[PDB]
């Protein structure tokens, strides 16, 4: 019952019922003119001050949440790419917040990097607050996908022609590499944004995941999490499960 565990539990419980959007940031494998662009082909470290700061935050989050009782053999390249994606995902969120003139402190958000059995690396984002309403979900997804596609093409480490960069940019938009949770529906039928409950989804779902400690990553595992209160960031896997237990 450390202060960190109690503090995270209390913070989540206070936000148990806060409605938020659910996004997933992802990428898909692309081959352009024989050039393979895989999930981890975006390893340029861009020298923009804010991005650099965000990437340092991800590194330190990884370092502090590492359990050293047990060994960890995650590939260095994998860690590097996840740290870079953490900074890029957050840059996208903050750019859209700027568009809406939303003070970052008025926003609740939670980010968790995972490895899916089929899709591989992806990043869940929960985000909402007083300046957010359900009808704005589709606009948010579109805007996020604009910035996500833009940053991915900038961060890509594969030597690309201008025509190839534009093709990659349009692939990332057309194929919706940022998804928005909606209610289930028919293909022809309208889709409605499905808001989720912030604290409940974090305590009862995201914090129940198993930590990735190997390459290849365990199917369904998580790499790294963070939130707007820096509450879950540094928690080790065992501590995260303790938070879930206390939350109930
Ligand atoms: Co997932």
Helices (H) and strands (E) in the chain, counts: 7, 8
- Expressed in angstroms and rounded, the spacing between residue 7 Cα and the centre of ligand 1 is 25
Residue 114 is labelled as binding a ligand: yes
For residues 119-129, one letter each, b for 16 or more C-beta atoms within 10 angstroms of the residue's C-beta and e for the rest, the string is: ebbbbbbbbbb
In 3D space, the residue among 206, 200, 201 whose CA is nearest the CA of residue 220 turns out to be 206
What is the H or E stretch that residue 36 is in?
Answer: strand 35-37
Q: How far apart are alpha carbons 212 and 188 in whole angstroms?
A: 39
Host domain of residue 172: 1-248
Residue 205 annotated to the active site: yes
> Could you give phi then psi for residue 35, rounded to 5 degrees?
-85, 120
* Cβ atoms within 10 Å, residue 247: 18
Structurally, the chain folds into a number of domains equal to 1
Cβ atoms 111, 227 nearer than 8 A: yes
Q: Pick the catalytic residue: 1, 183, 205, 247?
A: 205
Which residues lie below 8 Å from residue 55, measured CB to CB, with a gap of 6+?
A: 45, 83, 84, 86, 87
Resolution in A: 1.6
Distance (Å) from CA 107 to ligand 1 centroid:
22
- Report the structure determination method: X-ray
Helix ranges (DSSP H) in 182-234: 198-204
Residue pointed to by tokens 């001050």: 49
- Is 124 labeled as ligand-binding? yes
CA of 210 to the centre of ligand 1 (A): 11
CA of 206 to the centre of ligand 1 (A): 8
């Amino acid at each position: 019952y450390s202060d960190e565990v109690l503090g995270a539990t209390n913070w989540l419980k206070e936000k148990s019922n806060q409605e938020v959007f659910s996004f997933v940031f992802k990428n898909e494998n692309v081959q352009l003119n024989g050039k393979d662009i895989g999930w981890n082909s975006y390893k340029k470290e861009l020298q923009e001050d804010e991005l650099k700061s965000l990437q340092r935050g991800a590194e330190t989050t990884w370092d502090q949440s590492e359990d050293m009782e047990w060994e960890t053999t995650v590939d260095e390249m994998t860690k590097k790419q996840v740290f870079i994606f953490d900074s890029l995902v957050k840059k996208c969120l903050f750019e859209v917040l700027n568009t809406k003139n939303i003070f970052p402190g008025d926003v609740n958000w939670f980010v968790q990097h995972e490895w899916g059995k089929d899709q591989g690396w992806h990043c869940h984002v929960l985000i909402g607050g007083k300046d957010f309403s359900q009808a704005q979900g589709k606009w948010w997804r579109r805007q996020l996908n604009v910035y996500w596609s833009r940053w991915l093409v900038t961060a890509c480490n594969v030597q690309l022609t201008p025509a190839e960069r534009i093709k990659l940019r349009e692939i990332a938009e057309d194929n919706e590499w940022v998804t928005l949770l909606t209610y289930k529906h028919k293909q022809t039928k309208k889709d409605y944004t499905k808001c989720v409950l912030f604290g409940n989804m974090i305590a009862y779902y995201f914090l129940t995941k198993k930590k990735i400690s190997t390459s290849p990553p365990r199917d369904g595992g998580y790499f790294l999490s963070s939130d707007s209160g820096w509450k879950t960031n540094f928690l080790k896997e065992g501590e995260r499960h303790l938070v879930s237990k206390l939350y109930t």
